[PDB]
């Protein structure tokens, strides 16, 4: 619905050139200069390009903008992992008498073109705290990090039997090092935690499983 | 340098109003327009309007005309945005942004952005988190490390921040994105990897803030009671 139209997603491998289109009308891009904003995950937008093709100080030359008729384009050469972000075009609109934005493009940076090596997840599993148990609650916390590609499945076991009830697992998210993380939580009653020899969090990644196990009376 | 500091996260019921502030510094306050721009979760940027701190004139986005009000206080270099008759669709991060420097409203655009203020509009009940320590392993080996952390359990709405030792401890910290449980409540964990040899000699405190509920907790994370080494 946004006034300027951008692709929802663009992807490339490190080192390549990618482009992001921005289509408008004679009342905005056709008449007025285009700006671009870059929004890194979890941060505010920053001005990336102004006046079609001008860079603020600090923005590298591998970012370049252009305009042609009622459309504009952002080109990024030498694509780097840190370029993964949402990009927005913008221009003044004479008909609406105000600034308008494109809908945003999520730029993802893939693994190396020649093949990014698989990385198995690191798994840390915490048992319920004494504090939580005293409140008559219990949560097992399974933290999963450093995996690539960014997809895992998580299964929980009470002793050796599957448990599905009480399991909540996040989507994978990108880490600063370009690998991925996720977490999974198992909610139990303190009585259930007492009623088994152990519980386990089993993380499967690219067909291999990494398991961690905790028990109510051990001192790991 | 230009700095824009916004007020903290808020939660509101449908029908209520919210007033967000933006404190400016590092430039001559009355010489630059201030824009407001919002972003619904996972969605795009939407311009809300602009105010001239010299004189206080405003122009608002047509779609918000009639329930947005922008104002400023030139003595405190603060700009305010008030949005009334809130609905769920107004859930967004609200940004103030200083204009590039136009001498006219026409051709203005936001250049220097504040950190944003998350405003959640929901009929669900606000809940502050419980915070539990995640105690480190009792293992002791030369050059060994241990993971310790805090579990921030059952809060609504977002967001929550976690720091360690007032932000003095940053190496080896990994704060995980929250899970949204079927209960409608969030939980997250923050973990720090530290040397095992020094557990019990070092103090580790997680500072948790849930601004929508005005909850602030500082939880000490200590070696297990069963740990005979640390």
PDB file of N, CA, C and O in Angstrom, chain A residues 1 32 35 37 39 43-45 47 50 88 92 94 98-99 101 103 124 126 129 131-132 139 141 143-145 168-170 173 175 181-183 185 187 218-220, chain B residues 39 43-45 47 63 95 105-111 113-114 132-135 137-139 147 151 153 174 176-179 181-182 188-189 191 224 226-227:
ATOM      1  N   UNK A   1       0.821  -1.202   0.000  1.00  0.00           N
ATOM      2  CA  UNK A   1       0.000   0.000   0.000  1.00  0.00           C
ATOM      3  C   UNK A   1       0.861   1.261   0.000  1.00  0.00           C
ATOM      4  O   UNK A   1       0.419   2.314  -0.460  1.00  0.00           O
ATOM      5  N   UNK A  32      10.755  14.950  -8.046  1.00  0.00           N
ATOM      6  CA  UNK A  32      11.553  15.291  -6.882  1.00  0.00           C
ATOM      7  C   UNK A  32      12.648  14.281  -6.613  1.00  0.00           C
ATOM      8  O   UNK A  32      12.551  13.128  -7.025  1.00  0.00           O
ATOM      9  N   UNK A  35      15.591   9.965  -1.696  1.00  0.00           N
ATOM     10  CA  UNK A  35      16.471   9.637  -0.586  1.00  0.00           C
ATOM     11  C   UNK A  35      16.361   8.156  -0.260  1.00  0.00           C
ATOM     12  O   UNK A  35      15.340   7.520  -0.542  1.00  0.00           O
ATOM     13  N   UNK A  37      17.161   5.281   3.019  1.00  0.00           N
ATOM     14  CA  UNK A  37      17.525   5.018   4.409  1.00  0.00           C
ATOM     15  C   UNK A  37      17.904   3.564   4.591  1.00  0.00           C
ATOM     16  O   UNK A  37      17.324   2.674   3.974  1.00  0.00           O
ATOM     17  N   UNK A  39      18.259   0.663   7.574  1.00  0.00           N
ATOM     18  CA  UNK A  39      17.860   0.375   8.945  1.00  0.00           C
ATOM     19  C   UNK A  39      18.394  -0.993   9.336  1.00  0.00           C
ATOM     20  O   UNK A  39      17.818  -2.030   8.989  1.00  0.00           O
ATOM     21  N   UNK A  43      17.704  -1.111  15.083  1.00  0.00           N
ATOM     22  CA  UNK A  43      18.190   0.265  15.151  1.00  0.00           C
ATOM     23  C   UNK A  43      17.265   1.218  14.405  1.00  0.00           C
ATOM     24  O   UNK A  43      16.386   0.790  13.637  1.00  0.00           O
ATOM     25  N   UNK A  44      17.467   2.518  14.613  1.00  0.00           N
ATOM     26  CA  UNK A  44      16.755   3.530  13.851  1.00  0.00           C
ATOM     27  C   UNK A  44      17.293   3.634  12.427  1.00  0.00           C
ATOM     28  O   UNK A  44      18.455   3.317  12.164  1.00  0.00           O
ATOM     29  N   UNK A  45      16.451   4.082  11.496  1.00  0.00           N
ATOM     30  CA  UNK A  45      16.975   4.355  10.152  1.00  0.00           C
ATOM     31  C   UNK A  45      18.100   5.392  10.167  1.00  0.00           C
ATOM     32  O   UNK A  45      18.107   6.290  11.026  1.00  0.00           O
ATOM     33  N   UNK A  47      20.193   7.978   7.242  1.00  0.00           N
ATOM     34  CA  UNK A  47      20.213   8.467   5.871  1.00  0.00           C
ATOM     35  C   UNK A  47      21.411   7.884   5.132  1.00  0.00           C
ATOM     36  O   UNK A  47      22.555   7.996   5.587  1.00  0.00           O
ATOM     37  N   UNK A  50      21.050  10.875  -0.400  1.00  0.00           N
ATOM     38  CA  UNK A  50      20.107  11.980  -0.577  1.00  0.00           C
ATOM     39  C   UNK A  50      20.293  12.592  -1.960  1.00  0.00           C
ATOM     40  O   UNK A  50      21.361  12.466  -2.574  1.00  0.00           O
ATOM     41  N   UNK A  88      14.889   1.676   2.701  1.00  0.00           N
ATOM     42  CA  UNK A  88      13.679   2.425   2.334  1.00  0.00           C
ATOM     43  C   UNK A  88      14.021   3.560   1.397  1.00  0.00           C
ATOM     44  O   UNK A  88      14.923   4.350   1.680  1.00  0.00           O
ATOM     45  N   UNK A  92       9.717  13.541  -1.784  1.00  0.00           N
ATOM     46  CA  UNK A  92       8.595  14.431  -1.581  1.00  0.00           C
ATOM     47  C   UNK A  92       7.532  14.121  -2.632  1.00  0.00           C
ATOM     48  O   UNK A  92       7.857  13.859  -3.799  1.00  0.00           O
ATOM     49  N   UNK A  94       4.324  15.806  -4.489  1.00  0.00           N
ATOM     50  CA  UNK A  94       3.648  17.075  -4.751  1.00  0.00           C
ATOM     51  C   UNK A  94       2.130  16.979  -4.587  1.00  0.00           C
ATOM     52  O   UNK A  94       1.473  17.949  -4.204  1.00  0.00           O
ATOM     53  N   UNK A  98       3.694  16.092   1.022  1.00  0.00           N
ATOM     54  CA  UNK A  98       4.479  15.587   2.131  1.00  0.00           C
ATOM     55  C   UNK A  98       5.417  14.487   1.667  1.00  0.00           C
ATOM     56  O   UNK A  98       5.309  14.017   0.534  1.00  0.00           O
ATOM     57  N   UNK A  99       6.353  14.076   2.535  1.00  0.00           N
ATOM     58  CA  UNK A  99       7.287  12.988   2.244  1.00  0.00           C
ATOM     59  C   UNK A  99       6.553  11.658   2.172  1.00  0.00           C
ATOM     60  O   UNK A  99       5.643  11.409   2.969  1.00  0.00           O
ATOM     61  N   UNK A 101       7.219   7.217   1.558  1.00  0.00           N
ATOM     62  CA  UNK A 101       8.212   6.153   1.655  1.00  0.00           C
ATOM     63  C   UNK A 101       7.838   4.974   0.779  1.00  0.00           C
ATOM     64  O   UNK A 101       6.659   4.738   0.495  1.00  0.00           O
ATOM     65  N   UNK A 103       7.846   0.704   0.650  1.00  0.00           N
ATOM     66  CA  UNK A 103       7.436  -0.277   1.642  1.00  0.00           C
ATOM     67  C   UNK A 103       8.586  -0.969   2.347  1.00  0.00           C
ATOM     68  O   UNK A 103       8.375  -1.657   3.354  1.00  0.00           O
ATOM     69  N   UNK A 124      23.269 -25.034  25.407  1.00  0.00           N
ATOM     70  CA  UNK A 124      23.401 -24.904  26.856  1.00  0.00           C
ATOM     71  C   UNK A 124      22.032 -25.087  27.463  1.00  0.00           C
ATOM     72  O   UNK A 124      21.078 -24.438  27.052  1.00  0.00           O
ATOM     73  N   UNK A 126      19.831 -25.091  31.009  1.00  0.00           N
ATOM     74  CA  UNK A 126      19.724 -24.777  32.428  1.00  0.00           C
ATOM     75  C   UNK A 126      18.512 -25.445  33.053  1.00  0.00           C
ATOM     76  O   UNK A 126      17.415 -25.429  32.481  1.00  0.00           O
ATOM     77  N   UNK A 129      15.700 -22.916  38.499  1.00  0.00           N
ATOM     78  CA  UNK A 129      16.349 -22.317  39.655  1.00  0.00           C
ATOM     79  C   UNK A 129      15.634 -22.672  40.957  1.00  0.00           C
ATOM     80  O   UNK A 129      14.428 -22.918  40.978  1.00  0.00           O
ATOM     81  N   UNK A 131      14.945 -20.559  43.155  1.00  0.00           N
ATOM     82  CA  UNK A 131      14.002 -19.465  43.308  1.00  0.00           C
ATOM     83  C   UNK A 131      12.683 -19.778  42.604  1.00  0.00           C
ATOM     84  O   UNK A 131      11.597 -19.609  43.166  1.00  0.00           O
ATOM     85  N   UNK A 132      12.765 -20.232  41.363  1.00  0.00           N
ATOM     86  CA  UNK A 132      11.533 -20.525  40.651  1.00  0.00           C
ATOM     87  C   UNK A 132      10.766 -21.705  41.279  1.00  0.00           C
ATOM     88  O   UNK A 132       9.541 -21.659  41.411  1.00  0.00           O
ATOM     89  N   UNK A 139      10.992 -24.046  34.895  1.00  0.00           N
ATOM     90  CA  UNK A 139      11.258 -23.836  33.472  1.00  0.00           C
ATOM     91  C   UNK A 139      12.650 -24.341  33.161  1.00  0.00           C
ATOM     92  O   UNK A 139      13.597 -23.978  33.844  1.00  0.00           O
ATOM     93  N   UNK A 141      15.576 -24.214  30.344  1.00  0.00           N
ATOM     94  CA  UNK A 141      15.946 -23.223  29.341  1.00  0.00           C
ATOM     95  C   UNK A 141      17.055 -23.765  28.455  1.00  0.00           C
ATOM     96  O   UNK A 141      18.171 -24.027  28.922  1.00  0.00           O
ATOM     97  N   UNK A 143      19.358 -23.033  25.330  1.00  0.00           N
ATOM     98  CA  UNK A 143      19.895 -21.961  24.503  1.00  0.00           C
ATOM     99  C   UNK A 143      20.771 -22.544  23.414  1.00  0.00           C
ATOM    100  O   UNK A 143      21.673 -23.357  23.674  1.00  0.00           O
ATOM    101  N   UNK A 144      20.488 -22.124  22.188  1.00  0.00           N
ATOM    102  CA  UNK A 144      21.065 -22.744  21.002  1.00  0.00           C
ATOM    103  C   UNK A 144      21.767 -21.678  20.184  1.00  0.00           C
ATOM    104  O   UNK A 144      21.150 -20.689  19.776  1.00  0.00           O
ATOM    105  N   UNK A 145      23.059 -21.858  19.926  1.00  0.00           N
ATOM    106  CA  UNK A 145      23.803 -20.804  19.254  1.00  0.00           C
ATOM    107  C   UNK A 145      24.786 -21.317  18.221  1.00  0.00           C
ATOM    108  O   UNK A 145      25.084 -22.515  18.159  1.00  0.00           O
ATOM    109  N   UNK A 168       7.963 -24.238  24.200  1.00  0.00           N
ATOM    110  CA  UNK A 168       7.887 -23.013  23.409  1.00  0.00           C
ATOM    111  C   UNK A 168       9.256 -22.715  22.813  1.00  0.00           C
ATOM    112  O   UNK A 168      10.243 -22.577  23.537  1.00  0.00           O
ATOM    113  N   UNK A 169       9.316 -22.608  21.489  1.00  0.00           N
ATOM    114  CA  UNK A 169      10.585 -22.459  20.795  1.00  0.00           C
ATOM    115  C   UNK A 169      10.569 -21.258  19.867  1.00  0.00           C
ATOM    116  O   UNK A 169       9.606 -21.056  19.121  1.00  0.00           O
ATOM    117  N   UNK A 170      11.637 -20.467  19.898  1.00  0.00           N
ATOM    118  CA  UNK A 170      11.721 -19.309  19.010  1.00  0.00           C
ATOM    119  C   UNK A 170      12.106 -19.665  17.576  1.00  0.00           C
ATOM    120  O   UNK A 170      12.657 -20.743  17.302  1.00  0.00           O
ATOM    121  N   UNK A 173      17.393 -16.620  14.809  1.00  0.00           N
ATOM    122  CA  UNK A 173      17.752 -15.223  14.576  1.00  0.00           C
ATOM    123  C   UNK A 173      19.242 -15.102  14.261  1.00  0.00           C
ATOM    124  O   UNK A 173      20.042 -15.897  14.746  1.00  0.00           O
ATOM    125  N   UNK A 175      23.019 -13.963  14.460  1.00  0.00           N
ATOM    126  CA  UNK A 175      23.977 -13.444  15.433  1.00  0.00           C
ATOM    127  C   UNK A 175      24.901 -12.437  14.763  1.00  0.00           C
ATOM    128  O   UNK A 175      24.906 -12.306  13.536  1.00  0.00           O
ATOM    129  N   UNK A 181      20.992 -18.231  16.106  1.00  0.00           N
ATOM    130  CA  UNK A 181      20.643 -18.623  17.466  1.00  0.00           C
ATOM    131  C   UNK A 181      19.147 -18.870  17.606  1.00  0.00           C
ATOM    132  O   UNK A 181      18.341 -18.356  16.823  1.00  0.00           O
ATOM    133  N   UNK A 182      18.781 -19.637  18.626  1.00  0.00           N
ATOM    134  CA  UNK A 182      17.384 -19.853  18.960  1.00  0.00           C
ATOM    135  C   UNK A 182      17.321 -20.285  20.411  1.00  0.00           C
ATOM    136  O   UNK A 182      18.348 -20.597  21.025  1.00  0.00           O
ATOM    137  N   UNK A 183      16.119 -20.295  20.971  1.00  0.00           N
ATOM    138  CA  UNK A 183      15.963 -20.785  22.325  1.00  0.00           C
ATOM    139  C   UNK A 183      14.675 -21.573  22.442  1.00  0.00           C
ATOM    140  O   UNK A 183      13.725 -21.350  21.700  1.00  0.00           O
ATOM    141  N   UNK A 185      12.035 -23.343  25.551  1.00  0.00           N
ATOM    142  CA  UNK A 185      11.677 -23.357  26.956  1.00  0.00           C
ATOM    143  C   UNK A 185      10.710 -24.492  27.227  1.00  0.00           C
ATOM    144  O   UNK A 185       9.714 -24.646  26.508  1.00  0.00           O
ATOM    145  N   UNK A 187       8.157 -25.763  30.088  1.00  0.00           N
ATOM    146  CA  UNK A 187       7.473 -25.532  31.355  1.00  0.00           C
ATOM    147  C   UNK A 187       6.960 -26.839  31.953  1.00  0.00           C
ATOM    148  O   UNK A 187       6.317 -27.647  31.270  1.00  0.00           O
ATOM    149  N   UNK A 218      21.509 -33.473  40.629  1.00  0.00           N
ATOM    150  CA  UNK A 218      22.920 -33.480  40.277  1.00  0.00           C
ATOM    151  C   UNK A 218      23.522 -32.116  40.608  1.00  0.00           C
ATOM    152  O   UNK A 218      22.809 -31.182  40.980  1.00  0.00           O
ATOM    153  N   UNK A 219      24.837 -32.010  40.489  1.00  0.00           N
ATOM    154  CA  UNK A 219      25.500 -30.721  40.618  1.00  0.00           C
ATOM    155  C   UNK A 219      26.471 -30.573  39.459  1.00  0.00           C
ATOM    156  O   UNK A 219      27.683 -30.742  39.616  1.00  0.00           O
ATOM    157  N   UNK A 220      25.914 -30.277  38.291  1.00  0.00           N
ATOM    158  CA  UNK A 220      26.670 -30.201  37.053  1.00  0.00           C
ATOM    159  C   UNK A 220      27.529 -28.944  37.000  1.00  0.00           C
ATOM    160  O   UNK A 220      28.397 -28.830  36.131  1.00  0.00           O
TER     161      UNK A 220
ATOM    162  N   UNK B  39       6.640   3.129  12.792  1.00  0.00           N
ATOM    163  CA  UNK B  39       6.872   1.855  12.131  1.00  0.00           C
ATOM    164  C   UNK B  39       6.194   0.744  12.920  1.00  0.00           C
ATOM    165  O   UNK B  39       6.640   0.385  14.010  1.00  0.00           O
ATOM    166  N   UNK B  43       6.739  -3.857   9.778  1.00  0.00           N
ATOM    167  CA  UNK B  43       6.174  -3.094   8.668  1.00  0.00           C
ATOM    168  C   UNK B  43       7.079  -1.935   8.271  1.00  0.00           C
ATOM    169  O   UNK B  43       8.181  -1.791   8.799  1.00  0.00           O
ATOM    170  N   UNK B  44       6.607  -1.100   7.346  1.00  0.00           N
ATOM    171  CA  UNK B  44       7.422  -0.018   6.816  1.00  0.00           C
ATOM    172  C   UNK B  44       7.300   1.281   7.592  1.00  0.00           C
ATOM    173  O   UNK B  44       6.558   1.375   8.573  1.00  0.00           O
ATOM    174  N   UNK B  45       8.052   2.279   7.153  1.00  0.00           N
ATOM    175  CA  UNK B  45       8.036   3.617   7.736  1.00  0.00           C
ATOM    176  C   UNK B  45       6.830   4.429   7.259  1.00  0.00           C
ATOM    177  O   UNK B  45       6.477   4.394   6.072  1.00  0.00           O
ATOM    178  N   UNK B  47       5.410   8.435   7.634  1.00  0.00           N
ATOM    179  CA  UNK B  47       5.585   9.802   8.106  1.00  0.00           C
ATOM    180  C   UNK B  47       4.320  10.278   8.810  1.00  0.00           C
ATOM    181  O   UNK B  47       3.214  10.087   8.301  1.00  0.00           O
ATOM    182  N   UNK B  63      -3.792  11.111   6.951  1.00  0.00           N
ATOM    183  CA  UNK B  63      -4.455   9.979   7.590  1.00  0.00           C
ATOM    184  C   UNK B  63      -4.529  10.084   9.116  1.00  0.00           C
ATOM    185  O   UNK B  63      -5.322   9.386   9.746  1.00  0.00           O
ATOM    186  N   UNK B  95       9.348   7.300  16.083  1.00  0.00           N
ATOM    187  CA  UNK B  95      10.627   8.003  16.004  1.00  0.00           C
ATOM    188  C   UNK B  95      10.426   9.500  15.832  1.00  0.00           C
ATOM    189  O   UNK B  95       9.597   9.934  15.019  1.00  0.00           O
ATOM    190  N   UNK B 105       9.168  23.978   4.633  1.00  0.00           N
ATOM    191  CA  UNK B 105       8.534  22.689   4.851  1.00  0.00           C
ATOM    192  C   UNK B 105       8.649  21.832   3.593  1.00  0.00           C
ATOM    193  O   UNK B 105       8.927  20.639   3.665  1.00  0.00           O
ATOM    194  N   UNK B 106       8.442  22.436   2.430  1.00  0.00           N
ATOM    195  CA  UNK B 106       8.581  21.697   1.185  1.00  0.00           C
ATOM    196  C   UNK B 106      10.013  21.212   1.022  1.00  0.00           C
ATOM    197  O   UNK B 106      10.949  22.000   1.118  1.00  0.00           O
ATOM    198  N   UNK B 107      10.184  19.914   0.791  1.00  0.00           N
ATOM    199  CA  UNK B 107      11.513  19.362   0.572  1.00  0.00           C
ATOM    200  C   UNK B 107      12.255  18.995   1.846  1.00  0.00           C
ATOM    201  O   UNK B 107      13.442  18.640   1.820  1.00  0.00           O
ATOM    202  N   UNK B 108      11.564  19.087   2.972  1.00  0.00           N
ATOM    203  CA  UNK B 108      12.134  18.624   4.222  1.00  0.00           C
ATOM    204  C   UNK B 108      12.174  17.096   4.207  1.00  0.00           C
ATOM    205  O   UNK B 108      11.360  16.450   3.545  1.00  0.00           O
ATOM    206  N   UNK B 109      13.133  16.518   4.918  1.00  0.00           N
ATOM    207  CA  UNK B 109      13.146  15.074   5.146  1.00  0.00           C
ATOM    208  C   UNK B 109      13.929  14.765   6.411  1.00  0.00           C
ATOM    209  O   UNK B 109      14.841  15.509   6.774  1.00  0.00           O
ATOM    210  N   UNK B 110      13.574  13.667   7.091  1.00  0.00           N
ATOM    211  CA  UNK B 110      14.259  13.339   8.339  1.00  0.00           C
ATOM    212  C   UNK B 110      15.678  12.869   8.085  1.00  0.00           C
ATOM    213  O   UNK B 110      15.938  12.059   7.182  1.00  0.00           O
ATOM    214  N   UNK B 111      16.606  13.382   8.881  1.00  0.00           N
ATOM    215  CA  UNK B 111      18.003  12.995   8.749  1.00  0.00           C
ATOM    216  C   UNK B 111      18.586  12.335   9.988  1.00  0.00           C
ATOM    217  O   UNK B 111      19.189  11.270   9.874  1.00  0.00           O
ATOM    218  N   UNK B 113      17.894  10.570  13.472  1.00  0.00           N
ATOM    219  CA  UNK B 113      16.768   9.889  14.099  1.00  0.00           C
ATOM    220  C   UNK B 113      17.013   9.585  15.570  1.00  0.00           C
ATOM    221  O   UNK B 113      18.121   9.178  15.961  1.00  0.00           O
ATOM    222  N   UNK B 114      15.976   9.762  16.385  1.00  0.00           N
ATOM    223  CA  UNK B 114      16.013   9.288  17.764  1.00  0.00           C
ATOM    224  C   UNK B 114      15.998   7.765  17.848  1.00  0.00           C
ATOM    225  O   UNK B 114      15.892   7.067  16.844  1.00  0.00           O
ATOM    226  N   UNK B 132      14.748 -14.784  37.280  1.00  0.00           N
ATOM    227  CA  UNK B 132      15.379 -15.876  38.013  1.00  0.00           C
ATOM    228  C   UNK B 132      16.833 -16.028  37.583  1.00  0.00           C
ATOM    229  O   UNK B 132      17.154 -15.894  36.413  1.00  0.00           O
ATOM    230  N   UNK B 133      17.730 -16.310  38.517  1.00  0.00           N
ATOM    231  CA  UNK B 133      19.122 -16.530  38.144  1.00  0.00           C
ATOM    232  C   UNK B 133      19.308 -17.907  37.518  1.00  0.00           C
ATOM    233  O   UNK B 133      18.655 -18.871  37.934  1.00  0.00           O
ATOM    234  N   UNK B 134      20.206 -17.988  36.532  1.00  0.00           N
ATOM    235  CA  UNK B 134      20.585 -19.247  35.908  1.00  0.00           C
ATOM    236  C   UNK B 134      22.031 -19.511  36.326  1.00  0.00           C
ATOM    237  O   UNK B 134      22.978 -18.962  35.779  1.00  0.00           O
ATOM    238  N   UNK B 135      22.185 -20.344  37.338  1.00  0.00           N
ATOM    239  CA  UNK B 135      23.470 -20.494  38.011  1.00  0.00           C
ATOM    240  C   UNK B 135      24.505 -21.234  37.168  1.00  0.00           C
ATOM    241  O   UNK B 135      24.160 -22.133  36.395  1.00  0.00           O
ATOM    242  N   UNK B 137      27.726 -23.638  36.033  1.00  0.00           N
ATOM    243  CA  UNK B 137      28.257 -24.958  36.306  1.00  0.00           C
ATOM    244  C   UNK B 137      29.257 -24.908  37.455  1.00  0.00           C
ATOM    245  O   UNK B 137      29.993 -23.927  37.615  1.00  0.00           O
ATOM    246  N   UNK B 138      29.285 -25.974  38.246  1.00  0.00           N
ATOM    247  CA  UNK B 138      30.240 -26.094  39.342  1.00  0.00           C
ATOM    248  C   UNK B 138      31.608 -26.617  38.883  1.00  0.00           C
ATOM    249  O   UNK B 138      32.541 -26.698  39.676  1.00  0.00           O
ATOM    250  N   UNK B 139      31.720 -26.993  37.612  1.00  0.00           N
ATOM    251  CA  UNK B 139      32.972 -27.546  37.095  1.00  0.00           C
ATOM    252  C   UNK B 139      34.148 -26.596  37.308  1.00  0.00           C
ATOM    253  O   UNK B 139      33.999 -25.369  37.253  1.00  0.00           O
ATOM    254  N   UNK B 147      28.830 -20.843  31.639  1.00  0.00           N
ATOM    255  CA  UNK B 147      27.719 -19.981  31.266  1.00  0.00           C
ATOM    256  C   UNK B 147      26.834 -19.731  32.475  1.00  0.00           C
ATOM    257  O   UNK B 147      26.466 -20.667  33.195  1.00  0.00           O
ATOM    258  N   UNK B 151      16.910 -15.507  33.586  1.00  0.00           N
ATOM    259  CA  UNK B 151      15.680 -15.846  32.908  1.00  0.00           C
ATOM    260  C   UNK B 151      14.669 -14.764  33.241  1.00  0.00           C
ATOM    261  O   UNK B 151      14.377 -14.513  34.418  1.00  0.00           O
ATOM    262  N   UNK B 153      11.025 -13.990  32.865  1.00  0.00           N
ATOM    263  CA  UNK B 153       9.882 -14.869  32.643  1.00  0.00           C
ATOM    264  C   UNK B 153       8.524 -14.159  32.641  1.00  0.00           C
ATOM    265  O   UNK B 153       8.200 -13.431  33.575  1.00  0.00           O
ATOM    266  N   UNK B 174      25.306 -12.753  25.697  1.00  0.00           N
ATOM    267  CA  UNK B 174      24.400 -13.089  24.601  1.00  0.00           C
ATOM    268  C   UNK B 174      22.978 -13.033  25.146  1.00  0.00           C
ATOM    269  O   UNK B 174      22.561 -13.891  25.941  1.00  0.00           O
ATOM    270  N   UNK B 176      19.142 -13.289  24.237  1.00  0.00           N
ATOM    271  CA  UNK B 176      18.375 -13.972  23.201  1.00  0.00           C
ATOM    272  C   UNK B 176      17.047 -13.273  22.963  1.00  0.00           C
ATOM    273  O   UNK B 176      16.422 -12.783  23.911  1.00  0.00           O
ATOM    274  N   UNK B 177      16.596 -13.240  21.703  1.00  0.00           N
ATOM    275  CA  UNK B 177      15.248 -12.734  21.430  1.00  0.00           C
ATOM    276  C   UNK B 177      14.193 -13.511  22.211  1.00  0.00           C
ATOM    277  O   UNK B 177      14.343 -14.710  22.467  1.00  0.00           O
ATOM    278  N   UNK B 178      13.124 -12.824  22.587  1.00  0.00           N
ATOM    279  CA  UNK B 178      12.075 -13.432  23.380  1.00  0.00           C
ATOM    280  C   UNK B 178      11.254 -14.456  22.618  1.00  0.00           C
ATOM    281  O   UNK B 178      11.051 -14.352  21.394  1.00  0.00           O
ATOM    282  N   UNK B 179      10.764 -15.431  23.364  1.00  0.00           N
ATOM    283  CA  UNK B 179       9.733 -16.319  22.868  1.00  0.00           C
ATOM    284  C   UNK B 179       8.376 -15.737  23.257  1.00  0.00           C
ATOM    285  O   UNK B 179       8.230 -15.175  24.345  1.00  0.00           O
ATOM    286  N   UNK B 181       4.849 -16.971  24.115  1.00  0.00           N
ATOM    287  CA  UNK B 181       4.224 -18.240  24.462  1.00  0.00           C
ATOM    288  C   UNK B 181       2.731 -18.214  24.137  1.00  0.00           C
ATOM    289  O   UNK B 181       2.157 -17.157  23.878  1.00  0.00           O
ATOM    290  N   UNK B 182       2.110 -19.389  24.132  1.00  0.00           N
ATOM    291  CA  UNK B 182       0.689 -19.489  23.796  1.00  0.00           C
ATOM    292  C   UNK B 182      -0.178 -18.740  24.803  1.00  0.00           C
ATOM    293  O   UNK B 182      -1.326 -18.393  24.511  1.00  0.00           O
ATOM    294  N   UNK B 188      12.443 -14.228  27.930  1.00  0.00           N
ATOM    295  CA  UNK B 188      13.748 -14.209  27.271  1.00  0.00           C
ATOM    296  C   UNK B 188      14.822 -14.581  28.273  1.00  0.00           C
ATOM    297  O   UNK B 188      14.572 -14.618  29.478  1.00  0.00           O
ATOM    298  N   UNK B 189      16.015 -14.881  27.775  1.00  0.00           N
ATOM    299  CA  UNK B 189      17.156 -15.163  28.625  1.00  0.00           C
ATOM    300  C   UNK B 189      18.350 -14.368  28.159  1.00  0.00           C
ATOM    301  O   UNK B 189      18.497 -14.098  26.956  1.00  0.00           O
ATOM    302  N   UNK B 191      22.617 -14.602  28.762  1.00  0.00           N
ATOM    303  CA  UNK B 191      23.670 -15.446  29.311  1.00  0.00           C
ATOM    304  C   UNK B 191      25.032 -14.836  29.064  1.00  0.00           C
ATOM    305  O   UNK B 191      25.269 -14.202  28.036  1.00  0.00           O
ATOM    306  N   UNK B 224      26.167 -22.312  42.367  1.00  0.00           N
ATOM    307  CA  UNK B 224      25.238 -23.243  42.996  1.00  0.00           C
ATOM    308  C   UNK B 224      25.612 -23.535  44.446  1.00  0.00           C
ATOM    309  O   UNK B 224      26.786 -23.548  44.813  1.00  0.00           O
ATOM    310  N   UNK B 226      25.438 -26.294  45.827  1.00  0.00           N
ATOM    311  CA  UNK B 226      26.108 -27.589  45.848  1.00  0.00           C
ATOM    312  C   UNK B 226      27.562 -27.493  45.384  1.00  0.00           C
ATOM    313  O   UNK B 226      28.336 -28.442  45.537  1.00  0.00           O
ATOM    314  N   UNK B 227      27.928 -26.340  44.826  1.00  0.00           N
ATOM    315  CA  UNK B 227      29.283 -26.101  44.330  1.00  0.00           C
ATOM    316  C   UNK B 227      30.249 -25.916  45.496  1.00  0.00           C
ATOM    317  O   UNK B 227      30.152 -24.944  46.248  1.00  0.00           O
TER     318      UNK B 227
END
